[PDB]
């Protein structure tokens, strides 16, 4: 009858919340931690990849930070496989926006498109919701720097500092004390590195399992420079922060 094998993914609980997104919000906590700090001069995205070993390739390997546009970059926290489709759809939507308006897509539009994609599955279709939450960073002439976050529920809010993933509460509590409104990029970077050091489950902090994405604006005006910190430059900030 094709009924007994159905799990009723989009069903309201007796008290009144969904159950599949409820467990997706638990699956999020079991993934690698990510951190996002909103600084006056730029935005720093950092994440600690999980399941690290000596045989893990680090030369050309980015699994938590992804590029959607020359100005906009995102951080993935959750199941990378499900995040891949969302990343591809976001890139397609951004390129279609450039097709339609010939102007850089604002971050809010892409954030809405991805939230709608998640909500469509959380609403109908009877399919499991995406178990991934994003951290959006970008720039424009509308509101300057922007730092949103996503959820499997498909809701997004603006944040001056966020950390989705494992030990979210500890990272948030650590960052809220040290967060001011006037850091440069370097202060935010060192704060994020200290937070990652104090929230990690291992003992030391080796450059292999840390990823960095920064947004900077220098002599050139109107265009920021997006640089994904490679391991050779990654090991540099470790001595600057004093962790070494």
């Amino acid at each position: 009858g094709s009924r007994r094998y159905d799990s009723r993914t989009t069903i309201f609980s007796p008290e009144g919340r969904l159950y599949q997104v409820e467990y997706a919000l638990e699956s999020i906590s079991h993934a690698g931690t990510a951190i996002g700090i909103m600084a006056s001069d730029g935005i720093v995205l950092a994440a600690e990849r999980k399941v690290t070993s000596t045989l893990l390739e680090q030369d050309t390997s980015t699994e938590k930070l992804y590029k959607l546009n020359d100005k906009i970059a995102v951080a993935v926290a959750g199941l990378t496989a499900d995040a891949e489709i969302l990343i591809n759809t976001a890139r397609i939507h951004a390129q279609n926006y450039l097709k339609t308006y010939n102007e850089d897509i604002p971050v809010e539009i892409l954030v809405r498109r991805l939230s709608d994609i998640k909500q469509g599955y959380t609403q109908h279709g009877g399919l499991r919701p995406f178990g991934v939450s994003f951290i959006y960073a970008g720039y424009d002439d509308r509101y300057g720097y922007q730092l949103y976050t996503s959820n499997p529920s498909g809701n997004y809010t603006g944040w001056k500092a966020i950390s989705v993933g494992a030990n979210t509460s500890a990272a948030q509590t650590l960052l809220q004390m040290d967060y001011k409104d006037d850091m440069k990029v370097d202060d935010a970077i060192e704060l994020a590195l200290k937070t990652l050091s104090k929230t990690t489950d291992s003992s030391a902090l080796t450059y292999d399992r840390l990823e960095f994405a920064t947004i900077r604006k220098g002599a050139n005006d109107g265009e920021v420079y997006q640089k994904i910190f490679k391991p050779q430059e990654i090991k540099d900030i470790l001595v600057k922060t004093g962790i070494t």
Binding site: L18, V21, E22, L25, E26, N155
Partner: peptide, 11 residues
């Protein structure tokens, strides 16, 4: 810190 924060608030 020793507190499982919550789950349904994200909705």
């Amino acid at each position: 810190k020793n507190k499982v924060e919550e789950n349904l608030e994200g909705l």
